[PDB]
Design an enzyme around this catalytic site. Structure first.
Site, mmCIF file in Angstrom:
data_model
loop_
_atom_site.group_PDB
_atom_site.id
_atom_site.type_symbol
_atom_site.label_atom_id
_atom_site.label_comp_id
_atom_site.label_asym_id
_atom_site.label_seq_id
_atom_site.Cartn_x
_atom_site.Cartn_y
_atom_site.Cartn_z
ATOM 1 N N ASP A 1 10.226 -8.693 74.113
ATOM 2 C CA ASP A 1 10.076 -7.401 73.444
ATOM 3 C C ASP A 1 11.327 -6.517 73.578
ATOM 4 O OD1 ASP A 1 9.161 -5.027 72.349
ATOM 5 O OD2 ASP A 1 7.212 -5.111 73.351
ATOM 6 N N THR A 2 12.151 -6.507 72.536
ATOM 7 C CA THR A 2 13.386 -5.719 72.531
ATOM 8 C C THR A 2 13.139 -4.205 72.501
ATOM 9 O OG1 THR A 2 13.568 -6.112 70.133
ATOM 10 C CG2 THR A 2 14.954 -7.439 71.579
ATOM 11 N N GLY A 3 11.944 -3.808 72.071
ATOM 12 C CA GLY A 3 11.578 -2.397 71.980
ATOM 13 C C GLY A 3 10.845 -1.861 73.198
#
Ligand code: IOP
Lengths: 99, 99
Positions: free
Chosen positions: A25-27
């Site tokens: 999850d980059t966010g």
């Protein structure tokens, strides 16, 4: 690997001799997982996504394997619908977003 | 570009003719943009994440320029804390996670 995003970027994670699954999850700033009765002292913390806030338990120095790669860091434990590997661990495995 | 994750992967996007900043979010199925007006008809939708559900207006087939790359797809307008580019548009710009 090079993972396209047509489906959720789920990988196998190991933490405390339990194989589970998690979203790369980059966010997410932090790593958020379901309860796994983690060893050690913790601190309570608040985190928020879209939808409001959850009460989590902060464990530092947690050893975890992410798609084979060995990492160590803070893992928050709370009511998350899916297990989430945040940037804090993603940087440890050298994960990048490319286009 | 290749984006490391030591900070939030924010990029410039253009939507409704407006330049905005948004988070490249591999843990999001959908794109969620703060209150703005967009052309066409929307439908009422509820999206969930950590903390619970929020109410969004769904626009289909919206043109969007993400870091200079044109993409067409569904855009959800709502009370998001941060603009979010989800997988639905990340796949439109060929984005991949790499490690
Ligand atoms: O009133 C509005 O502006 C939109 C209301 C709205 C958006 N998504 C929704 C989902 C359920 C109920 C209402 C809504």
């Amino acid at each position: 690997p090079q993972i396209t995003l047509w489906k959720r970027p789920l990988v196998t994670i190991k933490i405390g001799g339990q194989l589970k699954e998690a979203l790369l999850d980059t966010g997410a700033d932090d790593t958020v997982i379901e309860e796994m009765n983690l060893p050690g002292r913790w601190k309570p913390k608040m985190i928020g996504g879209i939808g409001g806030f959850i009460k989590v338990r902060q464990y530092d120095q947690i050893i975890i394997e992410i798609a084979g790669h060995k990492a160590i860091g803070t893992v928050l434990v709370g009511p998350t619908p899916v297990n989430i590997i945040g940037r804090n661990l993603l940087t440890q495995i050298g994960a990048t977003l490319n286009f």
